[PDB]
C-alpha cells in the first residue's frame, strides 16, 4: 500500500504533496518505489546543472529490475530546453519514461497517480483454474 522512499529524498518538498497514499522511508535503490516493478527517480533541473554527472550514474545503477521506470524532472531553471533535450535522449536510450513536473505539488501528484495502478494486476481467471 505505501510508496517506499529513499532517505536520499529526505527534505524534498515533494513529500509534502504525497498525501493520498501512505509513504515511508526505506532502503531502496530508486528514489520512489511505486509498486512491485515500478519506480521513479526525481531530478531537479537546478540540481542537474550543479551535478551534471549525477543522473546518468543513478539511471545506470538502477538498471532493469523494475519494469516501469519513470524520471520525474522538476523544471525549475530558466531556459531548460537544452537540459531537457539531453535528458530526453538519455531516457530514450535507457528506456525510461520522462515526466515534466513544474512544481513539487505536481511531482507529488504524479507519484500518487503511478501508485494508483498495478502494472501487473492480479489475474483471477487463471488463478481460479
Ligand atoms: Hg526508476
From Swiss-Prot:
Post-translational modification summary for this protein: Ubiquitinated with both 'Lys-48' and 'Lys-63' linkages. Deubiquitinated by USP45.
Effect of residue 123 to A: Impaired interaction with ERCC4
Residue ranges of DNA binding: 36-58
The protein's assembly and partners: Heterodimer composed of ERCC1 isoform 1 and ERCC4/XPF. Interacts with USP45.
Associated pathology: Cerebro-oculo-facio-skeletal syndrome 4: A disorder of prenatal onset characterized by microcephaly, congenital cataracts, facial dysmorphism, neurogenic arthrogryposis, growth failure and severe psychomotor retardation. COFS is considered to be part of the nucleotide-excision repair disorders spectrum that include also xeroderma pigmentosum, trichothiodystrophy and Cockayne syndrome.
UniProt similarity note: Belongs to the ERCC1/RAD10/SWI10 family.
Listed name of the protein: DNA excision repair protein ERCC-1
Organism: Homo sapiens (Human)
Residues of the full protein shown: 99 to 227 of 297
